[PDB]
Amino acid sequence: AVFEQNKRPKIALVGSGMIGGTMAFLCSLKELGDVVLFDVVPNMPMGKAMDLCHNSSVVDNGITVYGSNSYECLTNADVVIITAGITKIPGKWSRMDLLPVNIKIMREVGGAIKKYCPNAFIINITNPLDVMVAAVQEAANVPKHMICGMAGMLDSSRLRRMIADCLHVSPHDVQGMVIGVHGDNMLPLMRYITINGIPIQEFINKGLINKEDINNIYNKTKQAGGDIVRLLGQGSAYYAPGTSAILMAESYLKDKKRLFVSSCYLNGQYNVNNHYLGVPCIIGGKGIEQIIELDLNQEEKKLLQGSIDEVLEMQKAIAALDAGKLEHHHH
Amino acid sequence: AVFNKRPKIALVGSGMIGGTMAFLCSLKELGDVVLFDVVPNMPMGKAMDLCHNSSVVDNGITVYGSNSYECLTNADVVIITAGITKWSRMDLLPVNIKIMREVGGAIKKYCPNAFIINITNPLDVMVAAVQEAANVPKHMICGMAGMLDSSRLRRMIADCLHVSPHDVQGMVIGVHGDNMLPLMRYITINGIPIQEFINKGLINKEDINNIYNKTKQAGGDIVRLLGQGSAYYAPGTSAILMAESYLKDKKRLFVSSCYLNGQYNVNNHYLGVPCIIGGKGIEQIIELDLNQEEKKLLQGSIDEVLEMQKAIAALDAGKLE
Ligand SMILES: NC(=O)C1=CN([C@@H]2O[C@H](COP(=O)(O)OP(=O)(O)OC[C@H]3O[C@@H](n4cnc5c(N)ncnc54)[C@H](O)[C@@H]3O)[C@@H](O)[C@H]2O)C=CC1
Numbered sequence A: 001a002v003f004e005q006n007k008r009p010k011i012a013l014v015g016s017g018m019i020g021g022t023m024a025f026l027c028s029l030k031e032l033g034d035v036v037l038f039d040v041v042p043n044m045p046m047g048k049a050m051d052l053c054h055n056s057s058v059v060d061n062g063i064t065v066y067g068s069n070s071y072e073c074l075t076n077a078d079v080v081i082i083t084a085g086i087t088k089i090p091g092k093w094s095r096m097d098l099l100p101v102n103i104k105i106m107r108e109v110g111g112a113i114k115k116y117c118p119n120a121f122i123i124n125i126t127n128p129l130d131v132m133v134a135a136v137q138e139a140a141n142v143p144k145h146m147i148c149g150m151a152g153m154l155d156s157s158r159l160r161r162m163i164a165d166c167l168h169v170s171p172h173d174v175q176g177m178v179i180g181v182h183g184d185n186m187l188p189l190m191r192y193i194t195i196n197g198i199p200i201q202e203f204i205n206k207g208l209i210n211k212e213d214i215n216n217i218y219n220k221t222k223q224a225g226g227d228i229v230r231l232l233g234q235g236s237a238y239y240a241p242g243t244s245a246i247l248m249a250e251s252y253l254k255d256k257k258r259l260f261v262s263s264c265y266l267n268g269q270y271n272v273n274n275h276y277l278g279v280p281c282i283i284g285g286k287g288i289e290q291i292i293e294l295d296l297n298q299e300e301k302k303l304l305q306g307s308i309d310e311v312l313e314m315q316k317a318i319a320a321l322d323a324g325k326l327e328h329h330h331h
Numbered sequence B: 001a002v003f004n005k006r007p008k009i010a011l012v013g014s015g016m017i018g019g020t021m022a023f024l025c026s027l028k029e030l031g032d033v034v035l036f037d038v039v040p041n042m043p044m045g046k047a048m049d050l051c052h053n054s055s056v057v058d059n060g061i062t063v064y065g066s067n068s069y070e071c072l073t074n075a076d077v078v079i080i081t082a083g084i085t086k087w088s089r090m091d092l093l094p095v096n097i098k099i100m101r102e103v104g105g106a107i108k109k110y111c112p113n114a115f116i117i118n119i120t121n122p123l124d125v126m127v128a129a130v131q132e133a134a135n136v137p138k139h140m141i142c143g144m145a146g147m148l149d150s151s152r153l154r155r156m157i158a159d160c161l162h163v164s165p166h167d168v169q170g171m172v173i174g175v176h177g178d179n180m181l182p183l184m185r186y187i188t189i190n191g192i193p194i195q196e197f198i199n200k201g202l203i204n205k206e207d208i209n210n211i212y213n214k215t216k217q218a219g220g221d222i223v224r225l226l227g228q229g230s231a232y233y234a235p236g237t238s239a240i241l242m243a244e245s246y247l248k249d250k251k252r253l254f255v256s257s258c259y260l261n262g263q264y265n266v267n268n269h270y271l272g273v274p275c276i277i278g279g280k281g282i283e284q285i286i287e288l289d290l291n292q293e294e295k296k297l298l299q300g301s302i303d304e305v306l307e308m309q310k311a312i313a314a315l316d317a318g319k320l321e
């Protein structure tokens, strides 16, 4: 137990790499709560925590960030945000080349949650997002409404930024959603884009944006993650992903009831049967408080089935792995 | 050029500290940002991520990435983190001075009215190189280190006394290095001298001496724990708060490396000293009434500045050219 007892929320970051550090920085700056940076790399999270305790002093608050290499640091966590995983193959892009490895990490993490903080609200980030969140849930056995995956907020923010830059309006007033799988089949819902509730079609008809811009933004949204990977040279995005996850955690901690496209457990909704998918939901002090079911048209249902199939395809790969079908002995 | 009403902040160097400061500009809505670096592509990747971040937090702050010094055009503030870094590696200083003079030349050409903050050590050497090539007023350029060191001192006193860091005043002056001087006599708790807390038994002199040493050892402690790299969160935020004080004419007091013309018995060199940063740059340099022991300790930093200037001149004059 690292969290010294006090009034503040206790935020446990399982994974202290690029995104974990970003999120700890945000907690310090926002005075959101005390933080533990947990990692398997020895001492590295203690170095970042020390830097971030200094940062709190820079901005005149006493938020404490702890570093830990022990799962027992999860004791009394109110929120757990997971970025744990192996993210590069030794010797040398897809959100799936390391699934066999990271599925096992997700199950150690889930078991740690079950043991040390079974009542926490859990946000997963580790890719492939929609099946990794399920792996955590099964190992942790937390209620379905107390766990989700961060992806839609990030994908939606990229759609919204591009519309905003095109129209010269604040992103504050661009409503936009990307649903489905956090992957190649992600579905930017171009029909549901609004400018302060005004359908984007009205702006199309006025000549403020044209159908070519719309089509390019649809494509660029799906490509944004890979575009960032290519430019960075090493690793993937971490600023916008960390802030997206932290806003979701803040909505839970302060009962804001804000709406986030998040990977949620569905049984019935969206033609999804007992697995996760990026859909609009409401996050408040009771966890996932509402799942909103859009009135998608036939074309959109067709596109969304591409996302659902991508998730199902991944479930079967995981079934095969767990069943031992993909390996054999020397003999 | 890459840059309206918003302030424009140029970040020369797009490593972790540079990205941290760009992130702060997005979160605080402080101004539009350009991440400059000599590496291709990487600053554009970070800028793309940060443009998405602005939208995550519902604002339109724009971060650009560039490999051309022309991106400094119309910058209101320039924060420099460029340079090559690692016994003694003074052999790297000539190339870093070359880099600094390239930046200063770009400043002279593209944003001569900017307020300039340098983070790359040794600050007296590197700040001067920029200033001389840029030909900017001495009150419009400084180095960041004192704010970082002081924030570390303040944090440790705060943790010991169980009071908010908001209410711990503390300063670390001199040269950022093994001769930095935490002024333990000037520590106050909302203006109350720390000695009153010593006499009352709330903190003892063993605690004080330990904190004096830990403040000097903090940067290396972090390096040792990280394995890779060094601190960048508190350093980045320290620099941005100095830039914000200039941009909003806040007149906040920071220990910064300022050009001295006789204060602290220093002439024509930069040293970490308390100063006031406002809309006119370095508006005031505060001269502390240091006692005898403190001036003696401060002399270690002053000797370090002067010894380093001599060594640099020796290396340059030894070049076959
Ligand atoms: N929309 C989304 O969901 C997005 C997801 N991501 C994903 O987030 C994940 C993390 O990204 P980064 O932070 O950049 O990677 P990173 O490699 O910087 O950090 C991952 C950390 O997890 C640690 N780790 C490994 N096993 C662990 C365990 N059992 N417990 C705790 N920590 C453990 C590693 O030591 C490493 O420090 C990746 O899978 C990445 O693909 C990235 C961007 C967006």
Ligand SMILES: OC[C@H]1O[C@H](O)[C@H](O)[C@@H](O)[C@@H]1O
Pocket (backbone or CB within 6 Å): A190, A191, A214, A215, A216, A218, A219, A299
């Ligand atoms: O991007 C071009 C088109 O692609 C998809 O089919 C979307 O449903 C449509 O709204 C979009 O305009």
Ligand SMILES: OC[C@H]1O[C@H](O)[C@H](O)[C@@H](O)[C@@H]1O
Pocket (backbone or CB within 6 Å): B182, B183, B184, B185, B208, B209, B210, B212, B293
């Ligand atoms: O500033 C003078 C300092 O000298 C030494 O470091 C002592 O440990 C410290 O207590 C004293 O204040």
